[PDB]
Amino acid sequence: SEQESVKEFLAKAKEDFLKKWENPAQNTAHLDQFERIKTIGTGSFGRVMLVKHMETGNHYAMKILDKQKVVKLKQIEHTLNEKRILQAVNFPFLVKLEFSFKDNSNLYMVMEYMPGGDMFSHLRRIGRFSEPHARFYAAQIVLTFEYLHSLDLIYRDLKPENLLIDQQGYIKVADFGFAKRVKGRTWTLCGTPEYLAPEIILSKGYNKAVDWWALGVLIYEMAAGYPPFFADQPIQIYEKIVSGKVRFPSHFSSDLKDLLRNLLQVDLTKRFGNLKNGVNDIKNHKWFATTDWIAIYQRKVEAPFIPKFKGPGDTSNFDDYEEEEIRVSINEKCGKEFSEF
């Protein structure tokens, strides 16, 4: 069976993950091994910089978290989740963590650098993706969620902003700031407004089904050019999501609509991904009938879009940000809170 080769794949993958989960990599480099080049991302949850490792010459993306800002934002345990999970995982469509370390002031996570930029920037520019184009990316997500959920991981922030395009035109999921290893239900309110399942909004206690709901949002946005539930302010977006009504553009194929009605399904006993058949309800769906799941895993499918290669440290696919100092205090901040990082 294809379901049995697959079960075998996941068994090996889990034994691999647990070994790193139970004994995490720690303190594997130092800031002064990296030359800083450019801020390619900034936000509430730290910034991301292009750097260059001197000993190898390799370019990398370095996420910096101010430990004091993390404590004030009450993201201590999420930050610890993020690093422990990213260091343990291993899958083609997950951005790979090369190093992590910390100093008196900061936490650092050095990832492989994707010069091609995020899906977001290309989706906005082009307007929308063709169904075949959107399906190609959706398949990568479907498989990644298959892998994550098999490890008891929920991702909780699927959106085009968190998806990077590599040099073969395949995607990498980045930012694990709200990922959590949980076997039961959980209750934290987190995610991005447009992508939130109704059960998060209504404060109910949820599981990995929220990840499949967010898949439906993503595929919709990719093929429509805009998301299924938008407005100018979050509370208005929440009223739309909980209403149970969604409108599709007249260009959506009738298979795409039917897939999306089962992903953006309020009723958890009916939502694709959450039922007795699990991820095969998605994988065997007619919209995906031309998808060869193994060749997508193997990166043998021809990509609809390969971004323009401008050098290994080129930054033209990212916007410009105001550059700040990386200041390292002479006193240790929050030693105890982050000891396991």
Partner: peptide, 20 residues
């Protein structure tokens, strides 16, 4: 159109995550 309403809205740039 729906696309035109989207493109005139304030939420066409990169969206931030929320938290309680």
């Amino acid at each position: 159109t729906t696309y035109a309403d989207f493109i005139a809205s304030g939420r066409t740039g990169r969206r931030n995550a929320i938290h309680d």
